[PDB]
Amino acid sequence: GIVEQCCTSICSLYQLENYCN
Amino acid sequence: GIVEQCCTSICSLYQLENYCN
Amino acid sequence: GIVEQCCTSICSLYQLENYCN
Amino acid sequence: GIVEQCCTSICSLYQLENYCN
Amino acid sequence: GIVEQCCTSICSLYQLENYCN
Amino acid sequence: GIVEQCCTSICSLYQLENYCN
Amino acid sequence: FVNQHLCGSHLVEALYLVCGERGFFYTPKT
Amino acid sequence: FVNQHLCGSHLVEALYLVCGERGFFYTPKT
Amino acid sequence: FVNQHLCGSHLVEALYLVCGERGFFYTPKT
Amino acid sequence: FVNQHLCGSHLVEALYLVCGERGFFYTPKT
Amino acid sequence: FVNQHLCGSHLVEALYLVCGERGFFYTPKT
Amino acid sequence: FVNQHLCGSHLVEALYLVCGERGFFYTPKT
Ligand code: NI
Numbered sequence: 001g002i003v004e005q006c007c008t009s010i011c012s013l014y015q016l017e018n019y020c021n
Numbered sequence: 022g023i024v025e026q027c028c029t030s031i032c033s034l035y036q037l038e039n040y041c042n
Numbered sequence: 043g044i045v046e047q048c049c050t051s052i053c054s055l056y057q058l059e060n061y062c063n
Numbered sequence: 064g065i066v067e068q069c070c071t072s073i074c075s076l077y078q079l080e081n082y083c084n
Numbered sequence: 085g086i087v088e089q090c091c092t093s094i095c096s097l098y099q100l101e102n103y104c105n
Numbered sequence: 106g107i108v109e110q111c112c113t114s115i116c117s118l119y120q121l122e123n124y125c126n
Numbered sequence: 127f128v129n130q131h132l133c134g135s136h137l138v139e140a141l142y143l144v145c146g147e148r149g150f151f152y153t154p155k156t
Numbered sequence: 157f158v159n160q161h162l163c164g165s166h167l168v169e170a171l172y173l174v175c176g177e178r179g180f181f182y183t184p185k186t
Numbered sequence: 187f188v189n190q191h192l193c194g195s196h197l198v199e200a201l202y203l204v205c206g207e208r209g210f211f212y213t214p215k216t
Numbered sequence: 217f218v219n220q221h222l223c224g225s226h227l228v229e230a231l232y233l234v235c236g237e238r239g240f241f242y243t244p245k246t
Numbered sequence: 247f248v249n250q251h252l253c254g255s256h257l258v259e260a261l262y263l264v265c266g267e268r269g270f271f272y273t274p275k276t
Numbered sequence: 277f278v279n280q281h282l283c284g285s286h287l288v289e290a291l292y293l294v295c296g297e298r299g300f301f302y303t304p305k306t
């Protein structure tokens with residue numbers, strides 16, 4: 001999920017857009 | 022400059038990227 | 043909606059709780 | 064204290080009201 | 085008081101230090 | 106660097122002024 | 127709990143505190 | 157839903173949220 | 187330049203930054 | 217150090233930085 | 247990515263997210 | 277009173293606090 005993708009691992013600002021509305 | 026533009030107007034993350042080292 | 047209400051007026055933590063998953 | 068109750072352990076928003084004025 | 089001064093006027097970190105425990 | 110001085114170790118608000126402009 | 131005046135990032139902060147973990151939807155007007 | 161960990165600046169943000177105009181004390185040595 | 191770790195309130199700040207008026211969902215149980 | 221214009225959560229942030237650890241009292245007008 | 251209205255500490259936050267690690271210069275008008 | 281740890285976004289908030297209109301540089305690779 002986002003926590004695994006961005007907190008446990010690392011993610012780009014582009015990955016973060018996956019969770020926009 | 023950038024600081025004033027983001028606050029009084031609007032700015033993009035792409036403009037902000039110019040201030041990275 | 044909630045976003046606009048909290049900013050232009052006032053809102054309670056109880057109203058915010060409606061937006062939890 | 065609050066650090067032990069809320070940081071080392073976990074606490075609810077209701078517990079946090081223990082430290083209002 | 086301090087809360088109102090920092091927001092409506094300006095305040096120094098030195099004034100804020102008076103509110104430390 | 107600042108990360109070593111202030112994050113890995115600890116630093117004072119006075120040390121932080123070392124990185125003003 | 128007290129009432130809240132919350133704009134921008136400050137609202138998302140409040141949502142995060144109130145919800146954790148349950149998560150939340152941030153849904154501003156278009 | 158289990159509760160969350162609040163430390164440091166995040167803890168005092170949450171105190172501000174809950175207490176607001178009532179005000180609060182943050183006393184970690186206690 | 188390698189990417190950074192974003193957790194908790196810092197993660198939702200970054201979601202707000204990227205998404206803004208589009209809005210977003212923060213769903214850690216997912 | 218420079219002078220500060222500080223409203224809402226931003227003041228509590230500043231108090232936290234200035235004080236740590238000593239802690240502080242947040243005491244707004246009623 | 248969306249456009250941003252950013253004042254005070256909120257701009258520095260945005261700079262930190264956009265840059266990490268590369269770092270950044272915060273350079274307001276005098 | 278011993279000093280505190282400041283990392284990541286919290287470190288740059290503190291830099292903004294101390295430096296304000298003077299501006300600053302955040303250069304973690306240094
Ligand atoms: Ni943090």
Ligand code: NI
Nearest residue numbers: 136226254256
């Ligand atoms: Ni703000």
